[model samples]
Target chain A: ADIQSFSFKNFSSFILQGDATVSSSKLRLTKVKGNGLPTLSSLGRAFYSSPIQIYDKSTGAVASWATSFTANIFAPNKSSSADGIAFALVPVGSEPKSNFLGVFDSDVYDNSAQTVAVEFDTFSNTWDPTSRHIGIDVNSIKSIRTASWGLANGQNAEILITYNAATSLLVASLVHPSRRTSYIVSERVDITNELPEYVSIGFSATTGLSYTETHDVLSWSFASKLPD
Target chain B: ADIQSFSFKNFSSFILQGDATVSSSKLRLTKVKGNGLPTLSSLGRAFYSSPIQIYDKSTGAVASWATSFTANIFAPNKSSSADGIAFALVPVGSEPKSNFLGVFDSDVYDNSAQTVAVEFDTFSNTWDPTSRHIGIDVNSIKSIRTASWGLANGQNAEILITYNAATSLLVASLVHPSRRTSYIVSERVDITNELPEYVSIGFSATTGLSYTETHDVLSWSFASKLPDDSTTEPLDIASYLVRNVL
Candidate 1:
C-alpha cells in the first residue's frame, strides 16, 4: 500500500508553463494581457512535479482519492468570457498544447489523449448547456455530466473533487459561501481504464479568441490512499 | 428536556383550510381550479393539530428546532407565476387570511401579528430580487434576506429549515438532488421576541391574481428541544407523501 499526498498553500512546488505564473501566493493560470488584438487565445498550465498513482495495474483496483482547492474566476463581462479552467489528470510527460484545456490538441474526442477532469467552465460552447457550468470530463473535452453554476460572475469559490473506488463515482462540488450557492456534478468513471497506473495531476485553462478572464487557484490539497 | 417531534409520512393528522386538501398522501396547499377567471387568487393553509412550545417563557429562552420537508411547485408558465409557498409559525388559533401567505392579512407588516416564516417565493414582486427565491421573513411579508432559487420551474426539492436559539440564527437550505443544485439562506433573529411561547406550526400558501400553480408538501418532519424544566415529549405526525418521487 502506498499513499501520495501534497498540500500547496502556495504555488512554490508547481511547474508552470505557457502563460501560467505564481504571483502573490496564487497560481494565476493566464497572464495579464496587454493591448493586443483583444481576441487572441491565451493558454496556461501548471502541474505538480510528481506523478500520482491512479491504480494498481496488476489488481486493477483504483485508489480512492480526494482534492480540495479554492478557485477564483473573474470575468469583466459575463456574456463574453472565455473557455474556463479544469483540474486535470494527464500522462506523466504531457505538455501544454494550443487546443482544448491546453492539454489536448485539436483532435477533440480521442481517448488516446487519456485524461479525466473536473471543469469550472464559464463559457458556453456548442455542446455546453449554459454559459456557466461545472462539468465532469472523462477522457474527452465533452463532459459526461454537468450542473449549472448558478452563481454570479467573479466567483470566489471552494471546490471539492472526490473519487470513491468502491462506487467508481467521481463527484465535484462547488460552494460559494458569500453567495450561499452550491453546485454539484458527479459521474461514475473508472479512470484506471482511461489513464496509466501513474498520472500527473494539475490545472489547465484557456482564454478564447472572443473573450478573456483571470483564472486562479489559491490553495490546493490532494490525497490518495490505496488498498494494502 | 421537552422534546416535541413529528414526522408527517401522510397528512392524516393535519387540519386543512381554504383550498388545502390531503390528496393521495400529499398536503396539496392549493386546490385544482376549474374553468373560471384565469387571474383569481388562491389561498390555502394546513397546520398540525397541537401547539408546540417555541420557548420557555419564564426564562425567555428559545428552543432549538429543525424541520425538513419535500415540496413541489409546478408552474405552467414560468414567466407569470403567483406567490409561492411558505412554512409558517403563527398564533395557535389564527385563521387563514386573504393576503400575503394565508396567515397574514392586508396589513402586510405588523409585529402585533407575531409570526416568522420561510417563503419559497416564485413571483418577483416589488421587494423581491427575482422571480424565484427563498426568503426569510420575520413579522412581515418583506424578507430580511433572500437567496436566488436557481432551480428550474416545476421543482421537486427537499428543503431543510433550522433555528439555533443560541445564535439566534435561522437557516433555510434547499436541495434539488436531480438538478444537482443547492441554495442556502440564513439570518439571525430571536424568534422568542417575535413569536409566542406556544405557536402552531403549519404551512400557508397563496397564488397571486395573475397566474397560479400547484404547491404541494409531499412530506414533513419537525423536532424541537426545549429546556429541561419543560419535559414533555410531543407526538409524531409523519407524512411519507411522495414515495418513490424524485
Candidate 2:
C-alpha cells in the first residue's frame, strides 16, 4: 500500500483515560514537507507508524532525497526503569524492531553509509556507561557525539534533520522546545557529505522506567514531490 | 421454541460422519422416518431413531419396550465390543447417551423406573454375565425381563415397541432392507404398562469387539398421545435438532 495520511486526534482523551495497558503500534503520515520527509510519529508512548516502505532503491543508486520522516517525544522516567527510545536513518531491508533489540538498539542499520542513526537515549545503558548525550552513531555501535543536555527529570532534546542528495546537507536541530528553547541543546556535523546519497528515516520510543509519564509526538510532517 | 416439523427427504442416503479420537465420543442418527411423527431407522451396522418424549415422577422410570427392538439382523449381546444399544426412556435432564451412560444393555437407568430402559445388549458384561438378549431394566441396575436373543454377531430378529401416554403404542422395526423380502422380521410390545407416566425417549448404540461401526436408527413411530405431566413436555424432534445445532 502507498503511504497515506495519519492522525492521533483522540490521543489526549486516550491518555487521560489512564488505560495504559493497551498499546497502539502502527500509525502513518500523509503529507511530506521541509528538507526531507518524516516517516512516523508517536502519541503518548504509542508508535504511530508500523513498518512501511520508505524507499526502494536497488541499483546501488541512492534517491536524491528522503521520502519519509518522523517525530516523537518522551516523558519523564516513570520510576527507576531501564530502557528508553531512539531515532534512526537506516538502509532499506532491516529487521523489524521488537523487545529483543536489547539495550544496544538492534534495529538501527549497522556499519555502512547505507545506514545512519541519531539516538535520543534514556537509560544509562552499559554500551555507553559514561556520557549520556545526543550523538551521531555511525556503522559502529558506539555513539560519536555525547553531550549532557541537563539533569532535570525531563530536560533532554535531540532533533534529527536531513537534506536530500540535491541539498547535499543533512542538518539536525536539537532544541529543548521548553523554556530553554534558545540553546541548540545538541548539534551534529553534516556527515552525509561523506556518506550515502539518501537514507530511510524513522523514530522510536520505549519505556523501562519504574515510573514514567507517557510520551507524545505533538506534531510532525514530511515533504517531497509526493502528494499529501 | 415451538415444536416444528422435520423431514429427512431421502433417509437412506444420509450419513453423519465425525472423528472421535481417544478422548472423543459422538452419537449420529441416519434413516429416521415416519408420518408426521418421528421414527427410527438403520444406517450400516448402527441404529438411529427420531426423537421421543418421556415423563416421570421421581426422575426414575423404565421403558422396557425397547428390549424388543433390534438393529437389522444383529441381536443384543452383553459381550460384544462396547456392548449393545439401549432403548432408554429417561428423565428429560438425564446425561447424554454416550458418557455417564455405560455400554449398551448395561442399564442406563440404573434399574430405576421413574425411567424405564430396554437394553439391546452386545457384550457379556459382568452385570448379567450370561444373557445376550433384550431385557426390561428398572432403576435397580437389574434386568426385569431378559431373554437371550442369540449369540453376538449372529443373525437375529429384534424390535422394540412402546406405548406411552402420548403415543400409547410405539414400535421400532429393524430389518436389512437389502436382504430377502421374507427376512422381514420385527418385535412389538406394549409400553403403557412398562413405562412411567412420562419420559424422554431415545436410543443409545455402542461398538465393542475392538471394531466399531456407525450405530443408527432406521425408522420408528409412536401411536398415542405423548405422556403429559408437570415435569415433562412433549418432545418435537425438529425443535430438539435445532436447539442442538443452532
Candidate 3:
C-alpha cells in the first residue's frame, strides 16, 4: 500500500476512536487530569485508509517511512508532569483500553509485543531518567535507545523520524522553530524481525494528576512506497 | 475509488499516457524539437484513481481545489516561443494529437469540445494574444478569460491555482525565484457545467520547430474532499474526550 500525505490544517480526515476530537485547526487527543497520576490511561491513535506493507516482496526490502509533526504536551507548570506520548508501529486490534501507550497491550515486551514506537515522553518512569526524553521502543515501553529532547509547551518544535533501509538505520531528529538547533537519536534494529510484515502505525499519548497536560498534534506527513 | 498524491522523490506512481519518463529525482513530459513545427503533437497525461466531482452532488456547490507546482516552459530564446502547457479536466480518451494543449480535441469555444482548462500559453495563435498569458478555457482551445502573465524561459516558476465554488471564482498565482513577486490571474466560470460528471485531470506541454523548449513539472500537491465520509459523521471537541481517541 502507498502512504498518502496527511496534513493537519483547517480541514482534516482522521479516524477518531476514543477521547479524540479534531477540528479544522487542532487535534486534541487528551485533557489534563487533576488527580495523582492518570486514573485511566488514554490513547489517541490515527491510521490511514489501509495498512501499508513495511515489506516490499519484489525488492525484498522493508519499506521505509519519514514522518514529522509539531506536537506539545502542556502541563499547568514544570513541577506538574505527565506520562507522555508515542508514535508506533503496532497491531491493528491491539489498542490497549486502560493502559499502555495505545500501541501494545500491557505485558510482553518481546517479539509478541508486536510493535515499534518512537516516543516523546515527559514524565520519567522507574526504568527511564527523571528528565524529558525521546526514545525508540521495540516490543516494549522501555526504550531501546533514548535521548534528552528538551521539550517545551508553547509550540515551535518539529520532530522527524526516518527509516533508511539501505543503511538499516532509524534516525529521529528534532529541531527548534528557528530550525537551526536540533537533537538526534538513532538505533539499528531489524524491523522485519522486530515487527510483523504488516502493521498499524500512528500516535498515542496519556496524561494524569496535577500533570494536566494537553496534547496537540499540529501537523504530520507520512509516506511509504510498495514494491512492484 | 481512491486518489493518491504524486510527489517527486521517487519513481512516481503516475500512469504515464504518452512520452512521459521518470527518474530518481524528476519527471520529464516533453523534450525540445529542432526542425520546424512539432511533427506529431503529443500529450503525456497522469490521472488520479477517482475523478473529482467538481461540486458536491447534494449541496450543489462546486468543490474548491488548490494546486501548486513548480514548472519550467523553456524555449530556445525570446523570439523562439514554445506552444506551452495546460492543467486540464478533460475526457480520458480525447488526448489531442497536435497543436491543441493535449487537453481538448480542437475547434469551437463551447461545450461538446468537452473540457475545462487553465492554460499557461506562450506562442500566439489567431485566437490568442501574442504576449505570454494564463487563462481559463471552457470546452475549447480558446480561452474564455485571459490575463497577461509575463513569463520567462529556463527557470523554475511556481504556479498556484485555486477554485472556490461559492463565488465560482478560479484564480491563478505565479512566482519566480529572481522575481520573488507573484502575479495573479483570475476568472469566473462554471466547470461543473462545462464538463461531464467525471473527468481526467493532468498537465500537458509541447515543443515546436523554430520554437524549441523543454517542459518540466518540478513538484506538485493536489488534495480534495467531499461531504460525508459517506460513512461516519465526524465528532467535535466535547465528544472527543469522552471517547478519548484520535
- DockQ of model 1, rounded to 2 decimals: 0.03
**Candidate achieving higher DockQ, 1 or 3:** 1
Off by over 4 Å in 2: A1-61, A64-82, A90-115, A129-131, A151-160, A164-169, A182-201, A209-213, A224-228, B1-246
The TM-score, computed over Cα atoms with residue i paired to residue i, of candidate 3 is 0.46
Q: Which candidate ranks first by lDDT, i.e. highest?
A: 1
lDDT tens digits, residue span A63-101, model 3: 656666677566667666676778777676655543455
Error of 2 at A122 (Å): 1.8
For candidate 1, lDDT tens digit of each residue in B1-246? Answer: 677777766764777888888777888888675642223487889999889988877865567777888888777777777788899999888877654766655335678778888988888777678558899888777888898886566767777676656556677767665565666676778686788879999898888774777888988888887865534322111111111110
Q: Would candidate 1 be rated incorrect, acceptable, medium or high by CAPRI criteria?
A: incorrect
Candidate 1, clashing residue pairs? B7-B237, B7-B238, B8-B237, B8-B238, B8-B239, B9-B238, B9-B239, B9-B240, B10-B239
Candidate 3 runs further than 4 Å off: A1-228, B1-12, B32-43, B56-61, B228-246
i-RMS for every candidate: 12.1, 41.1, 16.3
Ranking by lDDT: 1, 3, 2
On lDDT, the stronger of 1 and 2 is 1
